[PDB]
Each structure stands twice: as structure tokens, then as C-alpha cells.
Nucleic acid binder design. Sequence first.
RNA 1: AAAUUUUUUAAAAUUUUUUUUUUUUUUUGCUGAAACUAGCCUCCAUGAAGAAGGAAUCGCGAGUAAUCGUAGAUCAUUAGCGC
Lengths: 164, 368, 154, 24, 87, 132, 89, 53
Amino acid sequence: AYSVEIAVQGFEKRYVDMACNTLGDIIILAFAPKSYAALNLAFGPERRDVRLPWRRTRITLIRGPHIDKTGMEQFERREYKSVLTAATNCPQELARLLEAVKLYQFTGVQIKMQLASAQRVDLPADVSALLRXXXXXXXXXXXXXXXXXXXXXXXXXXXXXXXX
Amino acid sequence: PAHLRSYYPLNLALLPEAARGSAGAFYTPRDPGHERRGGCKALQQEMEATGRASILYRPIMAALNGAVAAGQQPRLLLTGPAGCGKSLALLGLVEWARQQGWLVVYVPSCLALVRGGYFARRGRGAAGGWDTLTSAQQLLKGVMDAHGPLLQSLPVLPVPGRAARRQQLQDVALRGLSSDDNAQLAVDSALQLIRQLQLLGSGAAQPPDSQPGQPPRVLFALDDYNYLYGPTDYGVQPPSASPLQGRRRVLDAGELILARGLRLLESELGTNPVAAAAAGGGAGGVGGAVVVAATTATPALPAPRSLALEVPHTVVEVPGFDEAETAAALAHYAATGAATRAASAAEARHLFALTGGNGRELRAKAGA
Amino acid sequence: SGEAGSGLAFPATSTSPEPAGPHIDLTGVTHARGKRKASAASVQLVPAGGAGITVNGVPLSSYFRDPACREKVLAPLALAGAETAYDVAARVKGGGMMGQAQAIATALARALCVQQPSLGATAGDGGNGEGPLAAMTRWDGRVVERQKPGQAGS
Amino acid sequence: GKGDNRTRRGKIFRGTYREQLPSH
Amino acid sequence: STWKGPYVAVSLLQEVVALARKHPNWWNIGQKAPEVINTYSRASVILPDFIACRFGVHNGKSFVGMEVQEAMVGHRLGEFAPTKATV
Amino acid sequence: XXXXXXXXXXXXXXXXXXXXXXXXXXXXXXXXXXXXXXXXXXXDVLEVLMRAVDNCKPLMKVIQSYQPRPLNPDQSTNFAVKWILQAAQKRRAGAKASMAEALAVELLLAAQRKGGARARRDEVHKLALDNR
Amino acid sequence: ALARVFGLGKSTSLAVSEACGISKDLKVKDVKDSYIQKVTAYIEANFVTGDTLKRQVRENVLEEVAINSRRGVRHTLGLPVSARKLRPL
Amino acid sequence: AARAAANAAAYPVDVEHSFCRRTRTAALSTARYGSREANRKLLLEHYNELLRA
RNA sequence: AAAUUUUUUAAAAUUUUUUUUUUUUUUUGCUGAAACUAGCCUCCAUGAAGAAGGAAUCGCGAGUAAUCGUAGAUCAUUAGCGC
């Protein structure tokens, strides 16, 4: 019971496009029934490829070096986004995914990844006794992504708890 | 019912405070044309518009008249969009009951209860409150000019069961009107009239020298009710700061005494256990002071546009001006000279869709 | 059904693109969309004597609460002469008040077009046609010109 | 000042009617 | 600035404690304190008492000698060290 | 029949006249219409406005040199309501009451073939006849 | 509604009127003189008559120029420290 | 007299209790220690302390 | 604990009055080491000219002028008017 979200950031639409297509190839390979003989596949209708617009902000400059206050010119940064959606139930192929994105290097393009997943929780027996139903899936971990030699293939990975 | 969707003229002699230069009684007489225009503001608008006094007979006022004559609910709320059948319908009910000769206290605009006029402190404490001389005294003069003979006809009835507490009507009105430098007297006289009219409508104290003859029916009409719930205009200096640093502790509606006493829907004293015993709460026991308030969508000071009411009561929405009576009102405007011309069926449907039931802007578009 | 391209690019100094169609849905309720500003709006039209007219949830006379703006809402409806008999269900987004009015006017016009073909303009026959309401179908997609990358300089 | 010091309007001109968010 | 710490006069105080070898303010009320006090910074505030002290304040070109009296007690010393733009 | 809406709307837009809400000028001009009703029956409104504006139509315009030019009558309406309104601000700044009263009394007087709008109006009529 | 006193400003004006009980929408042609005695008594409970204050600030900046201080020569010079037409002198 | 609904402030840190009505879910987040697992330890203790109510 | 406060010569507000413990949320002049010159904020008080501006002249014809906010930069804070 694991859910994966991959967010992807770029400057040239070419590179974020190739990134989206190659990770889509990886997902479909990663849960691929390559042979019939074992038959719990997740193409449930959660699955998407949601595209996204950007953060419109223009940053302008003086053209001239000295007096030149007539001399303006406009400049501009672009960020292009996609999100990649899947989820699955066994962990060994999830590890194949994480090691797959560990190997294939992508040019100029940020990988931010969301991994909400189920993980079991010990309780002191007092609160289990004093239990005797809603979602309450609240871990939401957080990690840094810079100033320590990483050009941002950061993985964030909130967690979902279960203790009935 | 044959008067349906028509106009009818208004007996203005039954209405003393409706159009009159209200606040200018107890001030200087003003510069002419400078008069502080209180009174019934919507009927002043209808008066300056058509040149006359006539209102359109909507069936919701017919249900209002039948319910008020019924006595099957003495506590009604009217709420709808601004002036759209509150002030018109309320004053129509007042004139209707005054053709039945009932005993009426009608506040024309509760804004004038809570705006302006010289004031003072009464007492200290939680029950200690605020008193405005002019607002209560204007209420006195309106009531006394409204029902002078009937007010003089009724003598001072003793209090139900608070004679045990103290042991442990034109009299009082003229007691209140007499002076303008002891305001606590005036406002206390006002609310003494309030409880004595509630007692008289209860039927608790029938006079020994009176005939077998039924008492005058108590009707209290309150236009723009929730000015008794919004914050006021009167403020005070807080006790902490210097007067130089004086931020204003603005006084509230519960901090007044008179309007707090004027909270009739929240008052228990229309639900009188004396009237629950002597009249029995029965359909033949119509013995409660039937009280009606309507409040607007346009407060002049920040009142809530709804009333979160704890006390049970019946609410009735005022519906908007439906298509037939918009055509009839436009025909009336074609009569009175406010219009130049008759309206088409297309333009009547157009105006109906336009103002949505707002009366005052329907009056505004009448030349068009 | 066979709808087609209805859109236009009418404006000066900045173009426009309202790619949304107007269409009737199988509930007997047509839906249409309209923007005349970058602020935008949609409509949904039921032939009914129910709640009448509705944008943004509320009845109209408090949301829009200038009268001239109200007849800017009602102007295609008043031009039609089919005022009463439809429930008007509608949604809006953006901008300023009478821009919302004339936008919702255009959308109401489009829904009325798919209700009655000849009153207003459509793409049923090659994106052409003529009725009284055919003028205000194609939206007036002029936006503000851009605040000039340059000077007052005076 | 367009009523800069004491109004419900000129204090949006002096950036105070918008209360400054706590940031640093 | 009275909130959360109202007074700053540290270097002035080091010189004041240098004066305070027999009396900070004529405890031995005031007698002009003939030893000159010459500060090097005028950002300093003035503290209550400190009367009859010969203060030499910097102007960026010299040291300006001014005797303090009872009125200038709630002031900051740089108000008495101008740039002399008289005309 | 729609020219009533045309002349009224041009009256509104020329009454806007400084940057503001045409709602403000629109309620102002409708207030002028109602004040025209009040002063007219005091000591019959679209009627008197249509008569006033049709009294005020400058049919042939002149261009200085002096040469007359024929004029499309919509600009005749448009000059017309213009001359009305600058005369209105003349009278109102001289009165410095509201503007609604001033535009009302001017629409009455230009209906009555009198006032500075009528003066300017028929002198440029006759001066168009002069220089042919 | 004494937005009308002159030797004071407006907020203290409505303060003094509130301190004897005058609300808004009252005119100066509508106050009986007992309240005038009350408000005058409250004026010497408050501070009085801004020309008394103008005398007061005359000795205040007299004190400041008696200090040989450059804001004193501002006040003998008329320079803005933030229209030398008006001065406090 | 105006403020944004989303204060989104700063110059502080917390456990950020929050609920999402869209999916009927509570949300608590991590902020105190540098590593993720130390924060998992802190919020796990906070979850146990949450259930003492 | 309980059925008390406030007027005139007969009334009025409460059924909550008076004690102890509590308790939040704002509030604090702000930011900086230091705000006199020379910052900024808030609130008092004093309330100037100015009642539309000559000769002369500039800019701009549709979502334009004007008017109205809004947010970004540099920035500890200081842009109210600058961009």
C-alpha cells in the first residue's frame, strides 16, 4: 500500500518532456506483467498525467550602463511542471523505482518526489487500552535540498500511519 | 379581498409621527429646510414621489392583518431585502389596526432610538446602563399625540406581583414629558408605560368603575428592529486613560436601558403567565400584547442582517413585488404624475426582473 | 451532435480565444460559456419557473447591486423577449462588476442561442447567421493594453 | 496626504490599513 | 526607545568612571568638575544626574566643549555637536 | 425610437467627464431628470428633453479660414449635448447647489429656446449662413 | 456633535461633549447653558485653550533655545527638521 | 484593518496541526531536528501524547 | 453564597449580585548595536498656503487619458510621492 507522486521542474520544455516520458516508461515497466503465469495490479482510476501552468513573473532591467533611464528591457524566467501519478502494493518494485531514478541522470531538471505510504506504528499499551476511525494519517516528513552539494533530486516522502 | 392588488389612500390623522418633523420638537426649531428628517423614511419617500399617501394592497399584508386579528401568534418577525415591504407593510398594519381603534405604540425608526441626543449615566454595574433623554422623550410625545384621549381614559394600574417585591397613564406620560435635565425620570417613565401597556394587554387588572367593555388592544410596531442589537453611536471615555489619549469605548445596545427594555421579541412579558392563566392560552383567550417587528437590509450602524433569536416566535419573509403588482404600481405611478406614460408588458417584466422585488429602486426607475 | 467553430478574435491591440462552445445537455438543460474580459463565466439553462435567475449562488439583486449593471445583466435576456420561463444557473470568475455583468450576458446569450437557433449567432451553419441577439454572441475580447514598458517621459 | 494620518482610506496609502504580516 | 532598554552611553560611561575617582557628581550639589571630559562619539544618550560635567563632543573636525545644565538631561549628546552651516 | 436612448447615453457619457463612475454620473443625470420633473410641475420629462435637444441641433457646421461644412446629425447631437454641458458647468460654478438642478434648469431653458446654449447655437447657425 | 470647538482639536472636542453628555447630531444652537458651565468646568479638568498652550510651548521652546542647542537655532532660523512662513515664534 | 486569511507567517517553528476537510484527514508536519527520522521520533511521541486525551 | 443595584416623592435595571481560584487571545512603539540632526510607526494638540493658476506650453484620439488600488525590486527598517 504505497503511493508515489513525482514532480518535475524545468527550463526547456524539451527536457521536462523527455523526463516525463522516460519516467512514464519506467512506471509502466515497473508494474508490468511480463508474463501471464502468476494469475492485484494498480491501474485504478486514481492514475493521471496532470500537466500544469507556471508562475508568471517578469523581471526587467536597465539596458544602458549609466544615464540611460529611458533604456529598459524585460527579462523573464520559465518553470515548466508535470506531476506523475501511480501507486502500488508491494515494496520491491518501489525500490526498483527509487533505484531507477537513482541511476538515470537528467539534465537541468529537478526531481521532487512524494511518497505517502502505509507503515505500522507501535503504541505504549496504555493508550491502546484507553482506546478501548477517521483518517488521521499525519506524519508529513521534511528534508532539506540545498547547501550540501545536491542539484535537487530531493525526495520528501510523507508517511501514513495505521493503528486500529 | 376585492381590494387585492390595488392602492388605497392613507388616513394620516391616525399617524402622528409618520411624516412629521420628528426630532425637531425638543431642539431649536431649525433653519427651514434643515429639519432632521426622521419619521417614516419609506413613506416620506412615497410621499415625495407620488405626492400622496397610498400603498399597494399585497396579499402578504392580508395574511398579516388576519394573523394579527387572529391572536394565534402575538410575536412576528418580518425580514426581507431593504425596505421592500417592511416599512410599507408595517405602516399598513398600523393604519389597519387604527381603523380598528387599537392602542398602538409605533417606533418609526429605531435608529432614532439609538442615534443622537443628550444622555447620562444611570448607576454602576451590570444592570447599570445608559439613558438617552431625547429618544425616549420623542417616543413619549409620539405616543401621547397618538392616543391622548385613550391614554387619559386609563388610570394607573398596579403591578402584577412586584408589589410583593417592593413590599419585600397619561399621569406617567406627563410625568416623563415635564423636564429635560433629569433624563432618568423620562426614560423610566417610558418603560413604565411599556410595562403598564403590557399589563393592560394582559387583562390582569380590570377597573372596578369600568363597564363590561373590552380593553383597547395593545399593538407594538418596531420598524428597523436590529438597531437594538448593533453597536450604537454613543460612546464613553474609558476609566483607564487620560482624556487626552481618549479612544472611545463605544456603547452597545444592551448597555442602553431603554432599547434593552424595547427588546419585545426577547421579552417574556408578552408570554405573560398572568395572561396564560386568566386567558388560558386559548383561541378565545386573545389576551397578549401582539407585537411585530420588521428590520431592514440597510442598517445605518453595523447591526446584523439576521436575528439569532432564542425566544420562540413566528418568522414571515416579505416576498418581493411580484409581476402583477409591479404592473399595478407602475399604473399607479402613471396616475400620480411620477411617470410620463404607461408601461408595456415587456417593460413591466423587465422591471420585475431588474429590481428583483426592491421597491425603492422600482420607484427610482419610474420615469424610465 | 454537429457543432462547429464559432469563435472570433474581434479586438484591437490584443487578441482573444474563447474556445468554449455552447451546447445542450441530455438533461434538457443547455450549458454555455462566456467571457468578456479575462474575467470569465459559465451558464446552465433550465426551462423552469423555479428559482429564476442565479449567478454565484445568491439571488442577483444583492450580488450585483448597481441597477445599471443589473440591466447590463438582463440586456440579452430583455432583447430576447423570453424572460421568465427559464431558470438561469450560472457561475462567474474574476475581474470587476460590470465586466462580470457583460460577460454573464454573453454567456446567457449563447445558451439562449442553442435553445433557439435563429435569435442569435452560432456555428450551426458555417459560423454565420442573423438575429437580434446574433450581435452580442461574439465576445468583445479587448483587454487592457499593457502598461507601457517605457516612460511617462514628459 | 489624501487624509494620510486619520482615515480608512489614506492609511491604505501609508501601508497601514493593510496590517504588515509578521515576517523577517 | 524606552521599551526594552532605553539608555546607551558606554564609552561616555568609561570616561565618566574615569572622572568618578573622587566624586561622579560632586558628592564631595555641583562645582563644574574642572577636569575636561572629551567623548569620541555623540550617539550617546544623557542619563539623569550627570550635571555640571564639561563635555567635549566630536563634530568630525574637532572637540566641542559644552557645559551640561538641568534642562539637557533627557537628550542625546549628538544634538549639541553640529556641522556649523550658519549662513 | 432608439435615439432617445442614444441622446440620453451620450448625455450620460458626457456627464461622466472626469474619470469616475459613470454610475455616479448616471445617478446624477437621472437625478437631473427627476429634478426636472419636480421644478417643472412645481412652478413631461423625456418630452421636454427631446424637445430641448431637437431645439438644439446644429445642422451645418463651419470651419475657420470661414468655410461651412455639412454635418452628419449624430455629431450634431454630440456637439449639442456638449454645449449644454459646458453651459451647465458655467451656471453651476457661478452658483458656487448640485449639478442635477443645473442640468435640469438648463434643459428647461434650452427647451424654451433661451439660454447661452441657444445663443451660441443660433449664432453659429447664422454664421454658417454668412460665409457661403 | 461639537466638532466645533476652536481652542482644542476635534477628538478632544467630542471627548469633552461626551464627558458632559452631548452626543452627535446636536448643534451649538441646541445646548442649554448649564451644560456650558459643565463643559467649562471640564475644560479646567482637561487642559485649556490652545493659546494658553501656545504661551506654554513658547516657554517650552524658549527652554530648548536656552539650551544652546541647534534645534534652538532652528527655531531662530526656521528650517525643517523632519515653509518657514509660519514659525512657533 | 485588513489581513490575509492565509497568514503563512515565519520566524518560528512548530508541529503544524491542520485538518483537510476535502478528504476528511488531519495533517501534522515535522520541523524541529535536522534528520527526518529524529522528526519521525518526535512526531511519533507527539502522536502517543495526542492519544493521552 | 444567592435572590441585589438606582431615582423622585412614586418608581426603575437582576433574580443573577459579592468572594476565591482561574484562565486564553491580543496588547508591548518598530527594526536595528546605536533612530536628536537624520529613519519609520501610533495618538493627541497647532491647523499654513491653496476657492482651479497669466504670458507661454506639453502629452495623448479604446479598454486610451484620468482616477483607483494592488506587488515586485533593492532592502534590518526606511519608496508616502521614485521606478
